[PDB]
Coordinates of C-alpha atoms in Angstrom, one line a residue:
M1 CA 8.4 -9.3 -7.1
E2 CA 9.5 -6.0 -5.5
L3 CA 7.0 -4.3 -3.1
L4 CA 7.4 -1.9 -0.2
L5 CA 4.2 -1.7 1.8
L6 CA 4.2 0.9 4.6
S7 CA 1.6 1.3 7.2
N8 CA 1.8 5.1 7.0
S9 CA 3.7 7.9 5.5
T10 CA 5.0 10.0 8.4
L11 CA 6.5 9.1 11.8
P12 CA 5.8 11.5 14.7
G13 CA 8.1 14.5 14.5
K14 CA 9.5 13.4 11.2
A15 CA 9.1 14.4 7.6
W16 CA 6.6 12.8 5.3
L17 CA 8.1 9.5 4.0
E18 CA 11.4 10.1 5.9
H19 CA 11.5 6.6 7.4
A20 CA 10.8 5.1 4.0
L21 CA 13.7 6.7 2.1
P22 CA 16.5 4.3 3.1
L23 CA 14.2 1.4 2.4
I24 CA 13.4 2.8 -1.1
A25 CA 17.0 3.6 -1.8
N26 CA 18.0 0.0 -0.9
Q27 CA 15.3 -1.4 -3.2
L28 CA 15.4 0.8 -6.3
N29 CA 18.3 -1.0 -8.0
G30 CA 18.7 1.8 -10.5
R31 CA 15.0 2.4 -11.3
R32 CA 14.0 5.9 -12.1
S33 CA 10.7 6.4 -13.8
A34 CA 7.8 6.4 -11.4
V35 CA 4.1 7.0 -11.7
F36 CA 2.2 8.3 -8.6
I37 CA -1.3 7.2 -8.1
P38 CA -3.0 9.9 -6.0
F39 CA -6.6 8.8 -6.1
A40 CA -6.9 7.9 -2.4
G41 CA -6.5 11.6 -1.7
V42 CA -9.6 13.6 -0.9
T43 CA -9.0 16.8 1.0
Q44 CA -5.8 17.7 -0.9
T45 CA -5.6 18.1 -4.6
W46 CA -3.9 15.3 -6.5
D47 CA -1.7 17.7 -8.2
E48 CA -0.3 18.9 -4.8
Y49 CA -0.1 15.3 -3.6
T50 CA 2.3 14.4 -6.4
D51 CA 4.8 17.2 -5.6
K52 CA 5.6 16.2 -2.0
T53 CA 6.4 12.7 -3.3
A54 CA 8.6 14.0 -6.2
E55 CA 10.4 16.3 -3.7
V56 CA 11.5 13.7 -1.4
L57 CA 12.1 11.0 -4.0
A58 CA 13.9 13.0 -6.7
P59 CA 17.2 13.0 -4.8
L60 CA 17.0 9.1 -4.7
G61 CA 17.0 9.2 -8.6
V62 CA 13.2 8.8 -8.9
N63 CA 11.3 10.9 -11.5
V64 CA 7.7 11.0 -10.3
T65 CA 4.9 11.8 -12.7
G66 CA 1.3 12.0 -11.4
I67 CA -0.9 9.6 -13.4
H68 CA -3.7 12.2 -13.5
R69 CA -1.3 14.6 -15.4
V70 CA -0.3 12.3 -18.3
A71 CA -2.1 12.0 -21.6
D72 CA -2.0 8.1 -21.6
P73 CA -2.1 6.8 -18.1
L74 CA -2.3 3.2 -19.3
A75 CA 0.9 3.6 -21.3
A76 CA 2.5 5.6 -18.5
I77 CA 1.9 2.5 -16.2
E78 CA 3.1 0.1 -18.9
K79 CA 6.4 2.0 -19.2
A80 CA 7.0 2.9 -15.6
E81 CA 9.7 1.3 -13.5
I82 CA 8.1 2.2 -10.2
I83 CA 4.4 2.5 -9.2
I84 CA 3.8 4.6 -6.1
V85 CA 0.4 4.6 -4.4
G86 CA -0.4 7.2 -1.8
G87 CA -2.6 7.1 1.3
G88 CA -6.1 8.5 1.8
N89 CA -9.4 6.8 1.4
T90 CA -9.1 3.2 0.2
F91 CA -12.5 3.0 -1.4
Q92 CA -11.9 6.1 -3.5
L93 CA -8.4 4.8 -4.5
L94 CA -10.0 1.5 -5.7
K95 CA -13.0 3.1 -7.4
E96 CA -10.8 5.5 -9.4
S97 CA -8.2 2.8 -10.2
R98 CA -10.9 0.5 -11.4
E99 CA -13.0 3.0 -13.3
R100 CA -9.9 4.3 -15.1
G101 CA -8.9 0.8 -16.2
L102 CA -5.6 1.0 -14.3
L103 CA -6.0 -1.8 -11.8
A104 CA -5.0 -4.7 -13.9
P105 CA -2.3 -2.7 -15.7
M106 CA -0.7 -1.8 -12.4
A107 CA -0.7 -5.4 -11.3
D108 CA 0.7 -6.6 -14.6
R109 CA 3.4 -4.0 -14.5
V110 CA 4.5 -5.0 -11.0
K111 CA 4.4 -8.7 -12.0
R112 CA 6.7 -7.7 -14.9
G113 CA 9.3 -6.2 -12.5
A114 CA 8.3 -2.7 -11.5
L115 CA 8.8 -1.7 -7.9
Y116 CA 5.5 -1.0 -6.1
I117 CA 5.6 1.4 -3.1
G118 CA 2.4 1.9 -1.2
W119 CA 1.5 3.4 2.1
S120 CA -1.7 3.3 4.1
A121 CA -4.5 2.9 1.4
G122 CA -1.7 2.0 -1.1
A123 CA -0.6 -0.9 1.1
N124 CA -4.2 -2.1 1.2
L125 CA -4.4 -1.9 -2.6
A126 CA -1.6 -4.5 -2.9
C127 CA -3.6 -7.2 -1.2
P128 CA -6.2 -9.5 -2.6
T129 CA -9.0 -7.2 -1.4
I130 CA -9.6 -4.0 0.6
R131 CA -11.7 -5.9 3.2
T132 CA -9.2 -4.9 6.0
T133 CA -9.3 -1.1 5.5
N134 CA -10.2 1.1 8.5
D135 CA -11.7 3.6 6.2
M136 CA -15.3 4.8 5.8
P137 CA -17.1 3.6 2.7
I138 CA -17.5 7.0 1.1
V139 CA -17.7 5.8 -2.5
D140 CA -18.6 2.4 -3.9
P141 CA -15.6 0.9 -5.7
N142 CA -17.7 -1.7 -7.7
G143 CA -15.8 -4.6 -6.1
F144 CA -13.5 -5.1 -3.2
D145 CA -10.9 -7.0 -5.1
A146 CA -7.6 -5.2 -5.4
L147 CA -4.2 -5.7 -7.0
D148 CA -3.7 -9.2 -5.5
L149 CA 0.1 -8.8 -5.5
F150 CA 0.7 -9.6 -1.8
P151 CA -1.4 -12.6 -0.7
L152 CA -2.1 -11.6 2.9
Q153 CA -4.5 -9.0 4.1
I154 CA -2.9 -5.9 5.7
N155 CA -4.8 -3.8 8.3
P156 CA -2.6 -0.7 8.4
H157 CA -2.6 1.9 11.2
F158 CA -3.1 -1.1 13.5
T159 CA -4.0 -0.5 17.1
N160 CA -6.4 -2.4 19.3
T161 CA -12.3 -3.1 19.0
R162 CA -10.1 -3.6 15.9
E163 CA -9.3 -7.3 16.7
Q164 CA -13.0 -8.0 17.1
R165 CA -13.7 -6.4 13.7
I166 CA -10.9 -8.6 12.2
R167 CA -12.4 -11.6 13.9
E168 CA -15.7 -11.0 12.2
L169 CA -14.0 -10.9 8.8
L170 CA -12.4 -14.3 9.8
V171 CA -15.9 -15.8 10.3
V172 CA -16.9 -14.8 6.8
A173 CA -13.5 -15.5 5.2
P174 CA -11.9 -18.2 7.4
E175 CA -9.0 -18.8 5.0
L176 CA -7.5 -15.3 5.4
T177 CA -4.4 -14.2 7.2
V178 CA -4.7 -10.6 8.5
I179 CA -1.7 -8.6 9.4
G180 CA -2.3 -5.8 12.0
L181 CA 0.6 -3.5 10.8
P182 CA 1.1 -0.7 13.2
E183 CA 2.2 2.8 12.3
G184 CA 5.9 2.9 11.9
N185 CA 6.1 -0.6 10.4
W186 CA 6.3 -2.0 6.9
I187 CA 6.6 -5.1 4.8
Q188 CA 9.4 -5.2 2.2
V189 CA 9.0 -7.8 -0.4
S190 CA 12.3 -8.3 -2.3
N191 CA 14.3 -11.1 -4.1
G192 CA 11.8 -13.7 -3.1
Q193 CA 11.2 -12.8 0.5
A194 CA 8.5 -10.8 2.4
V195 CA 10.2 -9.3 5.5
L196 CA 8.5 -7.3 8.4
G197 CA 10.3 -4.2 9.6
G198 CA 9.8 -1.3 12.0
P199 CA 9.9 -0.8 15.8
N200 CA 6.4 -1.5 16.9
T201 CA 4.6 -4.8 17.5
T202 CA 2.9 -6.4 14.5
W203 CA 0.1 -8.9 15.0
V204 CA -1.2 -11.6 12.8
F205 CA -4.8 -13.0 13.0
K206 CA -6.0 -16.3 11.6
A207 CA -9.3 -18.0 12.2
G208 CA -9.5 -19.9 15.4
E209 CA -5.9 -18.7 16.3
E210 CA -4.8 -16.5 19.1
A211 CA -3.2 -13.3 17.9
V212 CA 0.5 -13.8 17.3
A213 CA 3.1 -11.0 17.8
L214 CA 5.6 -10.8 15.1
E215 CA 9.1 -9.5 15.5
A216 CA 11.0 -7.2 13.2
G217 CA 12.8 -9.4 10.6
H218 CA 10.0 -12.0 10.6
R219 CA 9.6 -13.5 7.2
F220 CA 6.1 -14.3 5.9

C-alpha cells in the first residue's frame, strides 16, 4: 500500500501543502485522477476547500475532483487513482464518510492500489480508529472505527497533558501503539515500508513503556 500521512497541511511561513509536494511527487508514480474528501472542513465551504488542493496539485499531474461535486461518489472512489483527505474536525469527517457509505469504498480502493494522502484529520482517518484525535466531539460519527489502513494510532499536531491523555487510552486499550506526530512531520508508506519523516521529534507511546523518541527515517 501507498499512503502519505501528514501531521498538518502548512509549515510556518510556507504555503499550504508546500512541504508535502516533493513527497507526493515522489510517490505518485504516474497517477492522475484524484478525489478530494472535504468533509472534515467546517468553517470553510467544501467547494472552496477542493480548489486550494487542485491548485497546488494540478502541476504535479493530479486532477482533483471534490467528492461532494460528483454525481456518483461511490463510483468516483472506485475509479480514482488517488484519495485525498483534508484536515478539519475528525468526528465530522468520519460521520460524513460513514453516513455517505464511502468509508469501506475508500479503504477498498487504497487496498487495490490507490495512493492515499491525508493530513491532520485525514491522517487520523487512515488508522484503525479515531481514538487519538485532539478534536472536540462536535458530531457523533456512529462508531470510532476508521479506514484501518495503517495499523498504528496517530496523534497528529503532537505536543506535550497530551501524554497523560494518551496514557489513559493505553489503560483502556493496552494493545495500542500511539504515535505522537508533531507538526512538520509525516509517515510515508510505500513499497512495503512505513517511514517517518520531518524535522521535529516524534514520540511513540505503548502501555507500560516510557515514551520513545523516533528519528527521521525510522521504519515502523
